[model samples]
Target: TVSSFQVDCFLWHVRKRFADQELGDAPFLDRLRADQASLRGRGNTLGLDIETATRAGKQIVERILEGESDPASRYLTDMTLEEMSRDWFMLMPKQKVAGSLCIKMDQAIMDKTIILKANFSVIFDRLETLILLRAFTEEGAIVGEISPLPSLPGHTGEDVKNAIGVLIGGLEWNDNTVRVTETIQRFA
Candidate 1:
């Protein structure tokens, strides 16, 4: 199981990466462009499990909207999150933490939107597990630990946790190299 401490660190990094910039700023626009470029250019090349990501994206969009206040921001953010959810690539090289790839899942904490990383091993064996946890924004960003089951439909967070347990339980883990759990779940 990923610790709250690790989640906090991940959130801090995400905030630093995606937060604090006003809308229409160059940094935000540029990064958004780059992300789209990756999607348009290489996304089709990679064999991602679109169905799994779509489900995770749907659930994440629902969670993010819970805290929105501004009507324009809500609609805008909803559109972006929903749109990117489908186009999301597994990872960009720059998002990498050591050997594993970090998937980007973005969420809003009040008016500020921040990126969330759900890091996973390169092994495709645990792919679904990584994407599932990518949707649990509150658990990873606020709760400090991943709950066994999230309120989302389908598999309980426990089932997802069980998959995660497999990751930590030694399905494809190596305590020596892989530490500091995180991934790439995104909205840009």
Candidate 2:
């Protein structure tokens, strides 16, 4: 299982990279760009299963893999955080660690919103588990580690720790009515 600590670090890097790419305020600001709905906020939450990302992520890879070749500007198209993360790592030519953060965003966090849920890897697999901790947001913000790290004018770390704590507690999908940890039988 991914520790709260690990989740914390991943978030930090994700946000920083988002900033580095000049993509809004990282995971907080949500660089809304229409086509980048998978990565940023666009008023919808999907992709909890492999289909969500596998499709788009595959489309990008299929072309180049099929000999389309885009060593310079092929993957600059619609990509999820998971896809971008792998590509970036390949180019980095290094590894602080293995595994990856395959983000299955149920609608990226956006302004005036809170909570961001994810469909991460199973707690098994340990290290290279691609630690995907599902988070849940209210509007477009989320409860990253701190029981509710609202997307303020600026967010916006322990904030992560807090987010993790709250997320693990429970969640509810906007599309469905069954909560992640909310289920009960008529009798015990």
Candidate 3:
């Protein structure tokens, strides 16, 4: 199993790799959250039970972590499972897994997305080492080295991708209705 610190280091490197280029770290995170929020909103608009939708989303995340393909990957317009897997695997060392369980917990709440909030300092605290390791994994400036690192005996790139995918797919958000209620309650 990959340690959380290793995952964070890899992510940090990936963020820097894209920093000045087309996909910067901040923008990348923003885009990912936006996409997740859009999915949540669409689900709500369809009148899918909010709780069920949240639960289903969590299940998808869990499945992905367990090396299962997300069934809802079909609904995502921006990301392909192959692409996501490659990017994640490329950045992370063979032994280090990169994904967020925090996203899963936050997704369970149907009111708002909070895991990656600006004020949440601890979000990536434990993941710094992983992110750095991922940076080192890349051979040249752009492409990561293909050489495998020391990983769990049976681990494969597919396994890494699946685990990360589940975490990414599991991120939660609230619909307009829920946001409205919370906003009103705040003032009440």
Candidate 4:
């Protein structure tokens, strides 16, 4: 089992001499945390979990450590937000999941003006009624509630293309005031 010493060593770049602290160190920890705070924070605020992130971190860390250069910190200095986000999604655990659910108003579709709006916060997976259905009518980021959980409880994403289809027997929204013409599946 890894003790506080190991955590401090890996996270804070502290080395322990026997049972004491500050036996060795690295300058990387300080900057690494600052950079990762933003990258990992992307997952922390919400844990629809970043399976790929963990994968990337492990890969990078292992490769960097393969040469066993103590306090190696420069390797990640060039990592960009796009690279991090790209890898996180690239390695994300994919499966038959659902919840990029978009509902369209009958009027919009009937006029051949099909407006499929994804209100994931309002409707996720299978549901009877969702609150504030009017929200999320356009493209923006939202932490949504997924039903039956396609992957792990906190690791599921609501992307339309990758998520599995879970809509069943039509859906109702905003206390049934809005009429849903069709539930279309789109992508990110």
Candidate 5:
């Protein structure tokens, strides 16, 4: 089971990564209204399991930030923090799951919005590449994995490594952002 500390850290990361910056300065109710819309859209398309978990997470963070620590103040507080913790770990592909909820959530977010406000096609291409790389990493962990070795055409092993390195390297810059912990918590 993942520790609550780890879960908290990941949640922080997620918030930092996705929190609507434009609504940050608005009143709490207003912010909730805006997030409710975003949450609704996300919920409708991403499946209820993830959408509920995401909404629960958002509520917890919002309540905590507002200093509402009473048990009644928390939404989905009935959910075992431990269960949430365990689910985070269980969802990792290396732990025997065939696919990762974390990766799926990341993809959902990207598919739904123009993330980073950058070139959409380029971002999607890189996302696809990253997902493939994650799949390769997962396959490497399976027993008797004897599929024909394949490589990205024109891309050397070092090149692939460097590409992944660059992507991971960018994460360090966002370490200071608000929801960094929440984001990481989802994957803990």
Candidate 6:
């Protein structure tokens, strides 16, 4: 499960950190927030009870906010926003499990659309990962595929592909689809 609270807190601090920068981090955060808002909105359309996530998110953010000055000051500059969010998501404990959730977002259609890439893990005989790659209009419609990561043996790319097809679709989103691979590759 994705913690919307952590997502909100991360954005809040990042936006606050570069709130005064002229290098355009503010604008970038704005765009990122817009993209995520749309994605959450899409989650709503899919008949999901996002309220649970939202409630949990609220509780988490309150605690983080109490200690915001420390974590934000200490780690906000540890790396780029992309890398920091990824590490935090993977490293931070969620309900006792580590590396259970992570999410990445970037513009895929300039101001028209964006991509949201998320990873969820379930610990069984081994850590099994589930990847969800979806595109959304500036207004938040669903769009795109594939779990690119190599999980445990016997977890072939074909299995991931079929899983994605069953979960989302296999449509091509023109040039924007290229960004998906480029973004995931950077996770290496």
Model number with the top TM-score: 6
The RMSD (Cα, Å) of candidate 2 is: 23.4
> For residues 1-188, what per-residue lDDT tens digits would candidate 1 score against the true structure?
12322333233334444435544577766666664454344434554433333455544444665766231111112223332243332221112111232222222222322222343222332333323233222222321122223234433223444443333333122221122223332221
Candidate 6 structure quality by residue, lDDT tens digits, 1-188? 35654455345444544535556575676876775576577567655444544556566766777745441111101123353233212122212111222222332333343343434333322224444444344454433322344334435333544443332222232233323333332331
The C-alpha stretches of model 1 lying farther than 4 A from their native spots are: 1-23, 48-55, 60-188
| TM-scores for all predictions | 0.19, 0.18, 0.20, 0.21, 0.17, 0.22
Worst 10-residue stretch by lDDT in candidate 2?
179-188
Clashing pairs in 6: none
lDDT of 3: 0.30
Backbone clashes in model 4, listed as residue pairs: 48-155, 49-155, 97-163, 97-164, 98-164
- TM-score: model 4 vs. ground truth: 0.21
Question: Which model, 3 or 6, shows the larger TM-score?
Answer: 6
RMSD of each: 22.4, 23.4, 25.3, 17.6, 22.0, 19.1
The CA-based lDDT of model 4 is what?
A: 0.29
Better of 1 and 4 by TM-score: 4
Off by over 4 Å in 6: 1-116, 122-128, 145-154, 157-178, 181-183
Residue-by-residue lDDT tens digits, candidate 2, 92-178: 121111111111223222232333333222222211111233333343222232112123322112223333333333223323222
Model 6 score (lDDT): 0.40
- Candidate 4 lDDT over 1-188, as tens digits, reads 12222222243222223223443334444455554454455556544234444444454455667656552111111123332232111122212333433332221111121122333322234322221122111232111212233243332233432322221111122122222223323212
Clashes of each: 21, 30, 17, 5, 24, 0
**lDDT value, residue 127 of candidate 4:** 26
In angstroms, give how far residue 82 of model 5 lies from its true place. Answer: 25
* Alpha-carbon runs more than 4 Å astray in model 5: 1-131, 135-153, 176-188
* Model 3: per-residue Cα lDDT at residue 59: 45
Model 5 residue 96 lDDT? 17
Candidate with better TM-score, 3 vs 5? 3
